[PDB]
Design an enzyme around this catalytic site. Structure first.
Site, PDB file in Angstrom:
ATOM      1  N   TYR A  69      40.376  35.510  46.278  1.00 32.13           N
ATOM      2  CA  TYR A  69      40.686  35.405  44.706  1.00 32.13           C
ATOM      3  C   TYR A  69      41.645  34.309  44.166  1.00 32.13           C
ATOM      4  CZ  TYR A  69      38.979  40.156  43.589  1.00 32.13           C
ATOM      5  OH  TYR A  69      38.287  41.324  43.326  1.00 32.13           O
ATOM      6  N   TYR A 117      36.500  37.138  35.398  1.00 38.56           N
ATOM      7  CA  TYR A 117      35.569  36.158  34.434  1.00 38.56           C
ATOM      8  C   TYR A 117      35.797  36.369  33.174  1.00 38.56           C
ATOM      9  CZ  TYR A 117      33.415  33.573  38.298  1.00 38.56           C
ATOM     10  OH  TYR A 117      33.338  32.763  39.385  1.00 38.56           O
ATOM     11  N   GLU A 172      33.750  30.245  44.513  1.00 33.98           N
ATOM     12  CA  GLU A 172      32.020  30.709  44.473  1.00 33.98           C
ATOM     13  C   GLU A 172      31.135  29.791  45.379  1.00 33.98           C
ATOM     14  OE1 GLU A 172      32.801  34.139  41.745  1.00 33.98           O
ATOM     15  OE2 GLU A 172      31.868  33.647  43.598  1.00 33.98           O
ATOM     16  N   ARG A 175      31.680  30.740  48.950  1.00 41.64           N
ATOM     17  CA  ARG A 175      30.851  32.030  49.114  1.00 41.64           C
ATOM     18  C   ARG A 175      29.495  31.627  49.206  1.00 41.64           C
ATOM     19  NH1 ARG A 175      33.775  35.833  44.721  1.00 41.64           N
ATOM     20  NH2 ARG A 175      35.622  36.336  45.802  1.00 41.64           N
TER      21      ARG A 175
END
Length: 262
Positions: A69, A117, A172, A175
Site C-alpha cells: 500500500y 483508487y 501494481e 505484483r
C-alpha cells in the site's frame, strides 16, 4: 530502500527496479508454485521507501511491505521535506517520508481523499483514461514537484494523476508481470499504456487470485479456476487460467499466503 530514475529510465532499468522492489518486500522463506509472495504486516521494517527521481528532484514514496500500500510520499517544498498523506493514511506515514517530522499536518500536507483508487480517481478521473509509462509519469512529476498544494484546479488534479500512474507502475507492476510487460511495451510512448480490463481485474483481485493459486494441490501445470468477475484485455470474462500462464505471464508477487506446493 530503493530508487528508480524515471527521467533516464529504459524498459530494462524499469524491470530491474521492479525486481529490486519485489526482493525488498518478499517473504524470505515462503513460496507458492514457484512464485514469490509478500511478507507479513508484522515483520520489520514496516515500510520500504521508493525514491522516484527526475531532473528537478526526488519523490519519496512510503510503501507498506506486507500489502504494498502507498501510505504517502514527500517532495521538497520551500526548501523543506513536505509530506503528502491521504485522509486515511497510517499515522506513521508522515515521519516515514520526512524522518523525524513531528509537525501538525496542514493544507500543504493533506491529500483531500482516501488512498484507494476511488479516492484518487475522484480528483484524477478514471484511471482507464490515464496512460502508464515513462513519459506520463515524468510529466506529472514535473507538474507537481515543489508546487503549492493548495491549488485544487491544477495541482490536486495533477497529483491525483501522478499517484494513479505511480501506484500502478510501482505497486501494481511489482505484483503483476502482466502490467509490467504492458507498460514496457509502451514505455516511451506519450500515450503510455492505459490499463485494460485484465489489468483492472488483477488490481482488484490481488489477494483472491493469490488464494486460488495457493489452494491448488497439483504440482506442475494445471487449470486454475479464477475468482469471479475477472475480465480479459478485450473485456470478456476471464474465468480460468493455467498455472504456467499465471506464473509466467501474470503474477510476479502474490499476497502473503499459506501454500501447499512450494
Amino acid at each position: 530502500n530503493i530508487v528508480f530514475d524515471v527521467e533516464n529510465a529504459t524498459p530494462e532499468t524499469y524491470s530491474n527496479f521492479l525486481t529490486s522492489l519485489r526482493e525488498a518486500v518478499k517473504d524470505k522463506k515462503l513460496t507458492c508454485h514457484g512464485m514469490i509472495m509478500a511478507t507479513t504486516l508484522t515483520e520489520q521494517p514496516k515500510y520500504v521507501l521508493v525514491d522516484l527521481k527526475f531532473g528537478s528532484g526526488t519523490f519519496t514514496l512510503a510503501i507498506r511491505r506486507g500489502n504494498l500500500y502507498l501510505e504517502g510520499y514527500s517532495d521538497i517544498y520551500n526548501g523543506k521535506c513536505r509530506y503528502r498523506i491521504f485522509k486515511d493514511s497510517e499515522s506513521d506515514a508522515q515521519e516515514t517520508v520526512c524522518p523525524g517530522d513531528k509537525s501538525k499536518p496542514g493544507t500543504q500536507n493533506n491529500i483531500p481523499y482516501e488512498k484507494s483508487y476511488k479516492g484518487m480517481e475522484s480528483k484524477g478521473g478514471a484511471r482507464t483514461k490515464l496512460g502508464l509509462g515513462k513519459i506520463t509519469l515524468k510529466s506529472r512529476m514535473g507538474k507537481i514537484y515543489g508546487k503549492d498544494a493548495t491549488d485544487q484546479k491544477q495541482y490536486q488534479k495533477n497529483e491525483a494523476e501522478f499517484l494513479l500512474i505511480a501506484v500502478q507502475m510501482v505497486t501494481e507492476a511489482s505484483r503483476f508481470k502482466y502490467i509490467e510487460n504492458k507498460v514496457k511495451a509502451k514505455f516511451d510512448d506519450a500515450n503510455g499504456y492505459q490499463p485494460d480490463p485484465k489489468a483492472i481485474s488483477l488490481e482488484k483481485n490481488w489477494d483472491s487470485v493469490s488464494k486460488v493459486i495457493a489452494k491448488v494441490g497439483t504440482s506442475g501445470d494445471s487449470t486454475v479456476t479464477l475468482p469471479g468477475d475477472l475480465k480479459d484485455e478485450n473485456n470478456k470474462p476471464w474465468t480460468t487460467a493455467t498455472m504456467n500462464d499465471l506464473k509466467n505471464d501474470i503474477m510476479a508477487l502474490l499476497t502473503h499466503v499459506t501454500c501447499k506446493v512450494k
